[PDB]
Ligand binder design. Structure first.
Ligand SMILES: NC(=[NH2+])NCCC[C@H](N)C(=O)O
Lengths: 248, 248, 248
């Protein structure tokens, strides 16, 4: 059986939101190292990889590796009612077809218990592309979020140009033609060459909801290669998205 | 001939929003002892009693045991645009066919006068449930209101277990099962029975709007009988809702 | 070679907003006088004159006098993404098909630059009553706004009645009848004959959105005259609406 208590459900609420944006069901891999969702979107273009490390939690027990299919829709619909500042313990007793969240008040005056059915989740097609990333750029997560919401009013394909002295997000639509430019303030560009990719803005949008977790996001790029955008969870996990460049 | 000025219009606004959830039109029973609204919902499962005692107001004139039929659709739409912190004078002149709401700011610089046509509404047979209740829980009005929204993500029916330990709202549906357990002292049980009934959340919802009126709420239960939810309005009135149990 | 840099873009934002209320597109007359929009709604009942004198900018520049046709909806969408507290340099160049907006922060570490197609629009045919204005009445822009959306719960014709006592805003319909009355010698009435006209609230609504600019608002009237509602952009320009009265 697995047991994993978070001090503040804050985290789970902020986390499941991000990943429910990409996929409506995902397998949690629970080894003793910690919890680990790694799923693809249905178009096989974007991949989430989240790791919560054991020291993320106040209580963690997972003797042997169980895999739990959860419906992230339902999980979302529940965590939406769990209070920010309540604790949330997630258990599964090994034989059962259910997982169980339990939410206590600091002052123990109120206890909530919800239980969700597990699923058989079919395809773990996967393949964490991890190549070598030449170009990097790091910025206030919420700025990144605004910039994709901004580029969205124009077209549906942000074009990111990276150069010694800053980064240029450009889009184009019927409304006209935008560009936001961030001078290398703040904004830690640190590349090897000039480098320009483009990207489905739908997905950048799903990823940018990341800003709920980390003051700062990091985008990593390489030619012909999936960008990765990584949100650091404290020093106790990562939410990490990869997305195929647009070509054709 | 009647006039009822209240100092802070907030009271009227919050009240009409409360009973408007349940019914579209209702009779404003005006005695020398106070205003009373008694009204059953169209599906005959659910009752409002609303009393505002004579002291609740500032001016309150009413010899005659005079009645008023009022379109709460209309009344609500008007009270919407009346400043929370303005005076609201409800007047009806020796047999008009219209009520007049009149409104002034403290500084007497703005005056608002609204006129509503009255209805004939048959005073409903309905009558109040007769039971004395031996099982009472009192809890924070807003925690109550949260727990219905909470439970409604699962089902359309909520089971309320009263026990010396405390009340336990359970519900179930497609998403899965939940409950919210409260402990006694937040919460004031007065049981003498392992008594546990079930109820329509559509209605528990409508009721819990009561939170706008009173920081606490009392629920009363008789074995196989209508529950009452009471919202004390200062010590100058009550809003009382009664609802039928779900049974076999 | 037009250039028109405001310092706080919130003005461009708050303006286009008001006037987009009335028309989807509008010519921007750019004398070295300054920018002026002049335009009519589809139904040719209502008129917008706005003028920003050159003193209004921090870098005006306009040798000759170009007209600029703009899709206001396209411009409004772009201006929604622009930060209140940034630069906003406008700019047409000779024979050029496209105008260009250009935000930049105080801290000069984020250049934004957008590019809209110009339209061709049949220059304004009907062009200002240019009247006396017998009756006047100034009052808080925000209260005026409140009062129109008040009278909208009733009907969609407001009857404005002025005497020296104050100004009554009357309105009737299915719900009933309201009148909001304000008092003089903070309501700056002053007429030369009590008169009382009527108007479409549809349009008073669209106007009132000017409350975002001037804190006060001046209404002017005259028997069977196109009323006007003025809004000083403090003193670096104005925004003027004119509306045909409803007549018998
Ligand atoms: N668009 C992608 N995510 N492509 C990834 C490469 C192909 C395949 N997933 C593999 O590496 O085995």
């Amino acid at each position: 059986m697995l047991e994993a208590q978070v001090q503040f459900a804050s985290l789970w609420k902020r986390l499941v939101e991000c990943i429910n944006g990409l996929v409506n069901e995902a397998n949690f891999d629970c080894n003793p190292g910690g919890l680990s969702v790694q799923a693809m979107d249905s178009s096989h273009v974007a991949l989430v990889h989240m790791l919560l490390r054991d020291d993320c939690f106040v209580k963690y027990q997972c003797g042997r590796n169980s895999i739990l299919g959860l419906n992230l829709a339902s999980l979302s619909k529940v965590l939406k009612i769990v209070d920010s500042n309540d604790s949330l313990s997630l258990r599964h007793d090994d034989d059962s077809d259910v997982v169980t969240l339990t939410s206590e008040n600091p002052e123990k005056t109120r206890k909530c218990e919800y239980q969700l059915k597990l699923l058989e989740i079919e395809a773990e097609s996967m393949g964490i592309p991890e190549m070598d990333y030449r170009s990097t750029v790091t910025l206030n997560s919420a700025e990144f979020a605004k910039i994709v919401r901004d580029m969205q009013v124009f077209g549906d394909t942000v074009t990111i140009a990276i150069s010694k002295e800053g980064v240029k997000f450009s889009s184009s639509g019927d409304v006209g033609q935008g560009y936001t430019f961030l001078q290398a303030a703040g904004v830690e560009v640190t590349m090897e060459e000039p480098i320009t990719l483009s990207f489905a803005l739908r997905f950048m949008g799903i990823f940018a909801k990341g800003s709920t977790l980390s003051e700062r996001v990091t985008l990593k790029f390489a030619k012909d290669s999936p960008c990765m955008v990584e949100y650091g969870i404290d020093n106790v996990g990562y939410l990490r998205y990869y997305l195929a460049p647009k070509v054709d």
